[PDB]
Design an enzyme around this catalytic site. Sequence first.
Site, short mmCIF file in Angstrom:
data_model
loop_
_atom_site.label_atom_id
_atom_site.label_comp_id
_atom_site.label_asym_id
_atom_site.label_seq_id
_atom_site.Cartn_x
_atom_site.Cartn_y
_atom_site.Cartn_z
N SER A 122 0.85 -1.20 0.00
CA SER A 122 0.00 0.00 0.00
C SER A 122 0.89 1.25 0.00
O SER A 122 1.72 1.41 -0.89
CB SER A 122 -0.95 -0.01 1.21
OG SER A 122 -2.04 0.88 1.01
N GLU A 158 -9.07 -5.19 -3.50
CA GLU A 158 -8.42 -4.07 -2.83
C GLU A 158 -9.37 -3.05 -2.19
O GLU A 158 -9.04 -2.45 -1.17
CB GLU A 158 -7.52 -3.34 -3.83
CG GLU A 158 -6.44 -4.19 -4.47
CD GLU A 158 -5.22 -4.38 -3.59
OE1 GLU A 158 -5.23 -3.87 -2.44
OE2 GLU A 158 -4.26 -5.03 -4.04
N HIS A 196 -7.47 -6.04 1.04
CA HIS A 196 -6.30 -5.18 0.97
C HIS A 196 -5.41 -5.52 2.17
O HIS A 196 -5.86 -5.50 3.31
CB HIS A 196 -6.78 -3.73 1.09
CG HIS A 196 -5.70 -2.71 0.98
ND1 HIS A 196 -4.95 -2.54 -0.17
CD2 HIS A 196 -5.29 -1.75 1.85
CE1 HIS A 196 -4.12 -1.52 0.00
NE2 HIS A 196 -4.31 -1.02 1.21
#
Lengths: 532, 532
Positions: free
Chosen positions: B197, B324, B437
Site C-alpha cells: 500500500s 483491494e 487489501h
Amino acid sequence: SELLVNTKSGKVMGTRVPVLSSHISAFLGIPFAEPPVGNMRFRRPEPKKPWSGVWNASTYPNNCQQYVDEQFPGFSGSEMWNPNREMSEDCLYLNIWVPSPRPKSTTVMVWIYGGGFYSGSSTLDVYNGKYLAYTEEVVLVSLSYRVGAFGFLALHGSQEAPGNVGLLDQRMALQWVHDNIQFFGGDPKTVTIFGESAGGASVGMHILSPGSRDLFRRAILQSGSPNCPWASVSVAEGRRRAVELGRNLNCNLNSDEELIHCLREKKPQELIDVEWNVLPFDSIFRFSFVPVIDGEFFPTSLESMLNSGNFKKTQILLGVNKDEGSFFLLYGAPGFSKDSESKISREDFMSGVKLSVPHANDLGLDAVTLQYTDWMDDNNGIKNRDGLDDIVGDHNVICPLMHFVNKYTKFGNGTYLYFFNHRASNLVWPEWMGVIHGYEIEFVFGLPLVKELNYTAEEEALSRRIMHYWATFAKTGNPNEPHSQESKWPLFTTKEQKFIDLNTEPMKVHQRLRVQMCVFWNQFLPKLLNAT
Amino acid sequence: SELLVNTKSGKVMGTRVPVLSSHISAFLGIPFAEPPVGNMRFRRPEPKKPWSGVWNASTYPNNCQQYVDEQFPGFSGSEMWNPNREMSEDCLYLNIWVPSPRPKSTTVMVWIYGGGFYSGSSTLDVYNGKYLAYTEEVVLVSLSYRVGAFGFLALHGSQEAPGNVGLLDQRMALQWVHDNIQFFGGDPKTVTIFGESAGGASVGMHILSPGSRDLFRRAILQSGSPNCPWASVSVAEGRRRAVELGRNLNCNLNSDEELIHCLREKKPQELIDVEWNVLPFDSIFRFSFVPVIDGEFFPTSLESMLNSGNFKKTQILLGVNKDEGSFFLLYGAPGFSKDSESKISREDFMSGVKLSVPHANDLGLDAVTLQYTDWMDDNNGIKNRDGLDDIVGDHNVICPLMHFVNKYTKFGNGTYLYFFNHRASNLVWPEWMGVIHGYEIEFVFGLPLVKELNYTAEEEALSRRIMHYWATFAKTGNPNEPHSQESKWPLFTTKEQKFIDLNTEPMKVHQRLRVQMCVFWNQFLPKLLNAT
C-alpha cells in the site's frame, strides 16, 4: 365484374393474377395525386382530379425519379432493390391486392417502402402483396411517394419547396385509402400502416403528426423509427443542403425564388448526379434530403413530442434485424469487401467509427471505440468487423427504435417487440454481413411460400408464422390467436420490456433488447457531446 | 558474541529469538535518526549521533504518533493493524533479523510498512521478520517513518515544514542499511526494498527520486504504486491542507512561521483529532497528509518522470490483491456493514461512486457508473456491491499500478507481475470483502508456517512458495530457481504483458491484467475530465 370498381375518383379496371395455384384481384397503378411535375416539383401534392371512363389498373406504374445503385452490376443482391420500372416524376400511384371473392369489409394493410428517403419503389418483387393478401385474406395496399430532392428539398418559409412533401404524398395516399378502400372490400376503420427502414420511420412520423393520425388504426415499424439520427434534419440544415445543391448546379442563389426556379428547370438526373455532394460530413448511413422538423407536419421537436405523449395512442408492433449495419459498411467503410471475409484492422476500425458517428468530437469517438473494443484481443479482425457492424446498427437503428418503444409504451395501448435473427438460406450476400438490413421483408411478404425461390421448409413455416402475426395484429391489435395453443408473443411493458426472437427455432422470450448499448447511445453519449 | 555488533553509529546488543523450533538473532529498536521532537517536528530528519557503550536492541521501539482505528473495539481484524507499542514522536528506529550463524554477506530485504501515509508500525505481529529471515536465510530489516501531519505536513517554500520528511526518514534508514548492514552479515549491494500500500507507493517513490536510487538494488511493490491518486498532492493542495489544519486548532495564519510555531506547540493527539477535517472532498481512500510533488524529492511531475525514463532502472516484482477496495467501503460507504452481506441498492451504488471518484464532474460520475453497471440486472444487490468493490480497487490500486508497470517496463531490466486471489481460511472479516487489501502480507512474512495460527496445509505451502519467490528475486533479480522443475513465473514484457495468479491452485499464467477497466481509468476518464 370482380375486376371493376367504382371509386370516388372514378372507375378502375383491375386484373386477375395467379398466386400459389389460386387467384386474386390486383389493381395496379391507381393515381392518388396530380403528377407533381413542372411548376409542381417540390410542392405539396394535389388530389388527383376525378376521371370519366375506366382507369386501366392492370399494370405497375412508373417508379419515382431516384439514385440507382450500380456498385454491383448484374448482382441480384443489390439490383432487387433498384427500380424495376421506368423512372418518372409522374409517379404518385398506389397498388391494391384484393382477395377473391371480394371481401365486404376486411382488414387493410398499407405498405410504405423504405430506401433512406432517397430511393424505393412499390413495384419491387419483394413487395408483391399477392401472397400476403391471398394467404391472410386481407386487402393489401402499397403506395408510393417522392424521394430524394424531389420529395424532401426543404427551404422553410417558402410555399414552393416547404419540405416533407414526400410525407404528404404518403398521407394523401392514406387519405385515398380512407375514402375509397370500402369499394374494394376493405374496412377503412381497420387499416394498419407498416414499413421498413425509412418506411418504418415514416410510419412513426404519421403516428406523431397531428394531420396523419386519424387516417389509420394501427402501425407496424420494421427496422426504423421517427427519431433515427438519419431520418430528419433541422430547417436550418435543410436550407443549407438545398442551397449547396443549387451551388452544385450553378444556380442563382440570391433568393429562394431564384434557387427554386433554377432547380425546376433541371432534368431529374441532373439533381440526382450531385445529390450526395451536400452531406455535411464524410459519413455512412446519412442521406441528403430527408424529413425536416418544420413546426407544421411536426408541431415541435420529436423528443418533446415523445415525452409529452403528443402522438396517436394505439397498438404498435415493431422490431429490428440482427445485423442492420453490415450493408452500409460494405458500401462505404474502408476494409469491407463483398467477396472477402472483411476482417478489419485497428486502423480501419477507428476509421469506421469516425464515419459511423460523424457528429462526434474526439472525446465522443473515443467513448464509442472503448465501448465496442475488447482490449484483451484488440487486433482480432473478426471482432473489429463485428464491433463496427454493431456500432452502425445500434446507433442508426436498434438504439433509436428502443428509445421510441420505451417512450411510446408509456402512453400507448399495446406494444409488441421482435428481434429478427434468421439468415435466409438462399442469401447471395456474403456470410460476414449476417442478418442483413431489409431481409426480413421477404418473410413478411411470404416469398418463401413459392418453391421456385429455393427456401427451406422451415423458412416457409417461419414466413407463415410472421405473415399470420402481422395480419392478426392488423386485425385485432394483438399478433396472437385468442385461444391458440401456440407459443405466445408477450406484450412489451414498461416494467418487463419483453420481446421475442423471430427465427426457425422454438420461440424464446427475452428482456431489455441490447440495453447496455442503448443506454450508451441514448443516455451517455448525447450527454457527453452536449457537455463537451 | 553473536548478539554484539559494532556499527558506525556505535555498538548494539541484540537478542536470541525462537522461530519454528530453531533460533536467530534479532536487533530491535536501533535508532537511525535524532528524535524529531520539539523544534524538530515537521523538519527533515537528522542522522543519529554516534553513542558510546552498548545500545540495548532487545525490545521493540515505540510507534510513531498516529490516528488509531476504533471502529471495531476488540476485533482482531482491525486491531492487528493498530500500534502495539506506546506511541511517541520519538520513533525513528529500525529492526533487524539475522540468521544464525551470522552470515558473511547475504541478501538484504528492507520492509516499508503501509497505512495510507497516516498510520503504520514496524512492530505489528504480521511484520515479524523472523520467519522470512529464518526460512530464506536473508537479513530482514523493517524501518519506520513519520506519518500523518508529523511526516507530511507541507508548506512548500519554508525549510521548517517542507513536506516529504516521512520519505526522508525512510531514505535515512536506507542510508544506514547501506552504511552498516555489512556488520550484521548483509550485502549492502544486494538490498531489496519492499512494501505494501503506502509502503509500495513509497518503494516506487524511491525508484523515482534521484536521491534514493543509489541506496538499493531491487524493489518489490505490493498493492501500491507512486502514481496512485491518493499517494501524493500538489504543493498548492499541500499548503491548503496545512493551513486548514491550523484553522482547526485556531492557529495564527498570517505567516508560515506563525502557523508552524503554533502547530509545534500542540500535543500530538491534538493534530490527530482534527487531521481528517482537511480533506477537500467527501471521499473514500483519500488521506490528509501525503507526499507532495515538490520539485526536490520529485524533480518533476510523476507522469513526465515515468514517460522520460527518469528513474532507477533495475528489476521489479509487483502485484495486487483481488478485492483491494472492500476495506474502504466497509468503513466509509453507505450500505456496507461488517456483519451483513452488504447487498447494495441502486441508490447507494451511485452514492458510493460519488465517494470513490470525488474529483469527478457529473459526466465523469455517469461514465464510471455506466462502465460498472449491468443494465440487464441493475437492481441486483450483489452485483452493485461487487461493482463498487471493483471501482474502488481499480481506480485506487490496480489501474494505477498497471500504468506504472507498463511505463516502467519500457526502460527497466526485468518485471514480474502477480495477482493474489486466495482468501485465507482463517479470515475474521466477512465473506463479501473477499481477498482483502493487505492480507497477502501474512503469506509474505510466512505466518502460515506457524501451526497455532490455524492455516491449512495448502496455505503453508503457498506461503513458502511466495517467501521463496520474494527472496530468490531479492537475491538474483528473478523469482524463479535457475534449474528448477517447478512451474515458471514468466517475465512481464511490453508485448505479452504476462502475469501469474498467486493461490493454492496450480500456477496459471494470464495476460493484460484488467485491461478493459485500466484503459477506462488510465486513458478515457482522465481525457473526459480534462475536456469537460
